[PDB]
């Protein structure tokens, strides 16, 4: 919002840019706690092998 | 917490009241009789007060 606003002042502000990285797609894994305990699998074992 | 062989499940609330509460409940402040909080500030050794 502020970057767009500063773009409306090319006579005052120039090269106003973010000094960082942009958000990116991530791969989320959802471990089902129920089915895990229902198969005799430890969450610790899961989160370590992974 | 655990999945009964019966088929039921036991969750943390089933055995506890879960709420957001202070780390400790020892200190309680009142300003002119009304609820208050705040900071007691100690001057570092040698540092200027003003």
Q: Which region holds residue B7: left if phi is over 0, alpha if psi is between -120 and 50, else beta?
A: left
Resolution value (Å, 1 decimal): 2.7
Number of other CB atoms surrounding residue B29 within 10 Å: 9
Q: How many CA atoms lie within 13 A of B6 on its CB side?
A: 5
What is the four-CA torsion angle of B21, B22, B26, B32, rounded to 10 degrees?
A: -90
- Which residues in chain B touch residue A41, judged by CB atoms under 8 angstroms apart? none
Strand B2-3 and strand B9-10: pairing? antiparallel
Note the maximum CA span of chain B.
70
For chain B, give the number of residues: 50
- Asked if residues B9 and B3 have their Cβ atoms less than 8 Å apart, the reply is yes
Asked if the Cβ–Cβ distance from A34 to B9 is below 8 Å, we say yes
- What are the structure tokens assigned to B2, written together? 């655990």
**A35/B3 Cα distance (integer angstroms):** 10
**B14/B1 Cα distance (integer angstroms):** 9
């Amino acid at each position: 919002q502020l970057l767009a606003e500063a773009a409306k002042h090319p006579d005052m502000l120039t090269s106003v840019r973010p000094n960082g990285l942009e958000d990116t797609p991530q791969f989320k894994i959802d471990i089902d706690q129920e089915k895990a305990q229902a198969l005799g699998v430890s969450i610790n074992d899961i989160n370590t092998t992974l | 917490l655990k999945v009964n062989q019966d088929g039921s499940r036991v969750l943390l609330r089933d055995v506890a009241k879960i709420e957001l509460g202070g780390e400790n409940y020892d200190i309680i402040a009142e300003f002119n009789g009304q609820p208050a909080s705040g900071l007691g500030i100690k001057l570092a050794t040698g540092a200027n007060a003003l």
